[PDB]
């Protein structure tokens, strides 16, 4: 019987709070499909193999082969559109600055590498290495080449590093990277001095966390499973459609020229009609499953485009929408048939207990915190921000007042200082 994980009782009370005394950065991969292999099929050539006798007979079915062509053309065109929706959001090819003093943070794994024949990052090459017929079937190029995709992932990354949110809304504005992380910290309720007082620790954690992702992507192909499914399924569907040429459907042979050579028309055309009826039904089956599989990819493309706009171009407030923990920032990397995000997030890391009260009474008046929470070490009363222990003396600056003591449940006596 499977276990649903470790069992835990939280030490709750009417007066106990735990506050974290330290943090850790983390970087979490997320992988999404965007565009499957662009196929196309001429049913006339597939069904009848250049027999004019068969081809004339196929006209009795009317507008079937033209509408199956139109259906696969519809699928094949929106694969370029999905790739436009996800990557081509940025209106200019921004390029990386020549000096790398981003406050000690080290993007050299994810920025493009000029040594490469195609201008990809170090990590994009791990992605590209981990991911793994003539019967009137055809397979078509994407509009954007893989090299062009690597230019958009270069531009998005360079704008994000050098200019924060601003290149999404306006023109890209320069800003020092240490200040960009301070303003991202300030978006998650952690006061910005927590970054500047720890900048070297934070950079060391971040550079180490990027380092671990090369090792993650070196360890197993199973991480790429979502993209590897796209490749597997279209290849499986095609080989099923090709092997169906060999099926009899109750005709004397599945090699159409056997019928046309061994038999005259009055015998032959019934045998040809069995093969026609078979192959046409088998091709409708292939096209119908592609229409459904195309919508399955379309919802994944629109989800990827949503994360691109809400995270790479911004900072998402939305819980678990761009990595677990409190979200700071994200970087895209290009991949076969899809996109990869490296979400960067803040996790509070060393819990400590404190005694707490919702309000203090002093002057006969109830005091409440302007920001953060009241806490005590067992003798003194302090106020702290919610997400990182930083005890301050309670004053008429960091508190505000509402009425006499008597209405609040569990108010406590202490002085409040007036500087």
Ligand X SMILES: *[C@@H]1O[C@H](CO)[C@@H](O)[C@H](O)[C@H]1NC(C)=O
Ligand Y SMILES: *[C@@H]1O[C@H](CO)[C@@H](O[C@@H]2O[C@H](CO)[C@@H](O)[C@H](O)[C@H]2NC(C)=O)[C@H](O)[C@H]1NC(C)=O
**What residues numbered 358-417 form the site for another protein, per CB under 8 A?**
none
Using rule CB under 6 A, residue 413 touches ligand Y: yes
Separation of alpha carbons 197 and 200, rounded Å: 9
265-307 vs 64-87: helix crossing angle, rounded to 10:
20
- Pick one of ligand X, another protein, ligand Y, none as the site partner of residue 11 (Cβ within 5 to 8 A by kind): ligand X
Separation of alpha carbons 51 and 57, rounded Å: 10
Using rule CB under 8 A, residue 348 touches a copy of itself: yes
Q: Which is nearer to ligand Y, 195 or 313 (CB)?
A: 195
Closest CA to 41 of 12, 65, 18, 62: 65
Separation of alpha carbons 341 and 327, rounded Å: 13
Using rule CB under 6 A, residue 96 touches ligand Y: no
Name the DSSP letter for residue 321: B
Q: Which is nearer to ligand X, 43 or 158 (CB)?
A: 158
Separation of alpha carbons 285 and 292, rounded Å: 11
- Pick one of a copy of itself, another protein, ligand Y, none as the site partner of residue 259 (Cβ within 5 to 8 A by kind): none
Phi, psi (rounded to 5 degrees) for 231? -65, -45
DSSP β-ladder status, 399-404 and 365-369: antiparallel
Residue 182 C-alpha from the chain's centroid: 24
Least Å distance between CB 14 and ligand X? 4
Q: Which of residues 96-155 bind a copy of itself (CB under 8 A)?
A: none
With the C-alpha atoms ordered 255, 258, 264, 266, is the resulting torsion angle positive or negative?
Answer: negative
Using rule CB under 6 A, residue 351 touches ligand X: yes
Using rule CB under 6 A, residue 379 touches ligand X: no
Q: Which is nearer to a copy of itself, 147 or 320 (CB)?
A: 320
Using rule CB under 6 A, residue 239 touches ligand X: no
Least Å distance between CB 92 and ligand Y? 27
Question: Which residue stretch of 13-21, 47-55, 222-230, 337-345 sits at the interface with ligand X (rule: CB under 6 A)?
Answer: 13-21
Q: Are 123 and 339 in contact (CB under 8 A)?
A: no
| Per-residue x/- track, 151-190, another protein (CB under 8 A) | xx-----xx-xxx------x-xxxxx--x-----------
Least Å distance between CB 321 and ligand X? 29
Q: Which is nearer to ligand X, 353 or 402 (CB)?
A: 353
- Pick one of ligand X, a copy of itself, ligand Y, none as the site partner of residue 85 (Cβ within 5 to 8 A by kind): none
User: Using alpha carbons only, how large is the chain's radius of gyration in Å?
Assistant: 32
**Residue 181: C-alpha distances to residues 175, 187, 297 (Å):** 10, 10, 34
- Pick one of ligand Y, a copy of itself, ligand X, none as the site partner of residue 24 (Cβ within 5 to 8 A by kind): ligand Y
Figure out which of the listed residues 134, 409, 418, 419 binds ligand X, where binding follows CB under 6 A. Answer: 409
Closest CA to 140 of 88, 82, 75: 75
Least Å distance between CB 130 and another protein? 23
Using rule CB under 8 A, residue 42 touches another protein: yes
Using rule CB under 6 A, residue 201 touches ligand Y: yes
Find the DSSP H helices in 308-359.
Answer: none
- Pick one of a copy of itself, another protein, ligand Y, none as the site partner of residue 22 (Cβ within 5 to 8 A by kind): ligand Y
Least Å distance between CB 353 and ligand X? 4
Figure out which of the listed residues 216, 302, 410, 413 binds ligand X, where binding follows CB under 6 A. Answer: 410
How is residue 202 written in tokens?
A: 């934070």
**Any bridge partners for residue 30, and if so which?**
341
**Residue 87: C-alpha distances to residues 7, 51, 144 (Å):** 43, 45, 10
> Which residue in the block uniquely carries the two structure tokens 């222990």?
389
How is residue 389 written in tokens?
A: 């222990």
Q: How crowded is residue 199: how many other Cβ atoms within 10 Å of its Cβ?
A: 15
Grouping H, G, I as helix, E, B as strand and the rest as coil, residue 30 is strand
Using rule CB under 6 A, residue 212 touches ligand Y: no
Q: Which of residues 350-379 bind ligand Y (CB under 6 A)?
A: 377-379
Separation of alpha carbons 292 and 296, rounded Å: 6
| Binding site residues, a copy of itself, CB under 8 A | 60-63, 67, 71, 89, 165-166, 168-171, 173, 175-176, 178-179, 182, 192-193, 196, 240, 243-244, 246-250, 273, 278, 282, 284-285, 288-289, 291-292, 295-296, 298-299, 309-310, 313-314, 317-321, 324-326, 347-349, 351, 356, 358-359, 366, 368
């Amino acid at each position: 019987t499977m276990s649903l994980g470790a069992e835990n009782s939280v030490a709750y009370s009417n007066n106990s709070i735990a506050i974290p005394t330290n943090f850790t950065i983390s970087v979490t991969t997320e992988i999404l499909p965007v565009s499957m292999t662009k196929t196309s099929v001429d049913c006339t050539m597939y069904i009848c193999g250049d027999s004019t006798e068969c081809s004339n007979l196929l006209l009795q079915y009317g507008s079937f082969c033209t509408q199956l062509n139109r259906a696969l053309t519809g699928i094949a065109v929106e694969q370029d559109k999905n790739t436009q929706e996800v990557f081509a959001q940025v209106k200019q090819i921004y390029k990386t600055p020549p000096i790398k003093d981003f406050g000690g943070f080290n993007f050299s794994q994810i920025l493009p590498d000029p040594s490469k024949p195609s201008k990809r990052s170090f990590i994009e090459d791990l992605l590209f290495n981990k991911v793994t017929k003539f019967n009137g079937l055809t397979v078509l190029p994407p509009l954007l080449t893989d090299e062009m995709i690597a230019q958009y992932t270069s531009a998005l990354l360079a704008g994000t590093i050098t200019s924060g949110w601003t290149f999404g809304a306006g023109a890209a504005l320069q800003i020092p990277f240490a200040m960009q992380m301070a303003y991202r910290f300030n978006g998650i309720g952690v006061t910005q001095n927590v970054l500047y007082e720890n900048q070297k620790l934070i950079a060391n954690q971040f550079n180490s966390a990027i380092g671990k992702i090369q090792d993650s992507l070196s360890s197993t192909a199973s991480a790429l499973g979502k993209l590897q499914n796209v490749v597997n399924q279209n290849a499986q569907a095609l080989n099923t459609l090709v092997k169906q040429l060999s099926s009899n459907f109750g005709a004397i042979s599945s090699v159409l020229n056997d019928i046309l050579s061994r038999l005259d028309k009055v015998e032959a055309e019934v045998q040809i009609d069995r093969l026609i009826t078979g192959r046409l039904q088998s091709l409708q089956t292939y096209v119908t499953q592609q229409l459904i599989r195309a919508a399955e990819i379309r919802a994944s493309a629109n989800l990827a485009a949503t994360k691109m706009s809400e995270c790479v171009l911004g900072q998402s407030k939305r819980v678990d929408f761009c990595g677990k923990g409190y979200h700071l920032m994200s970087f895209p990397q290009s991949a076969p048939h899809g996109v990869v995000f490296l979400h960067v997030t803040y996790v509070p890391a060393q819990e400590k207990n404190f005694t707490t009260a919702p309000a203090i009474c002093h002057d006969g008046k109830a005091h409440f915190p302007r920001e953060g929470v009241f806490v005590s070490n067992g003798t003194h009363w302090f106020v702290t921000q919610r997400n990182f222990y930083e005890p301050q003396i309670i004053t008429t600056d960091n508190t505000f007042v509402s009425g006499n003591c008597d209405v609040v449940i569990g108010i406590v006596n202490n002085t409040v200082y007036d500087p």
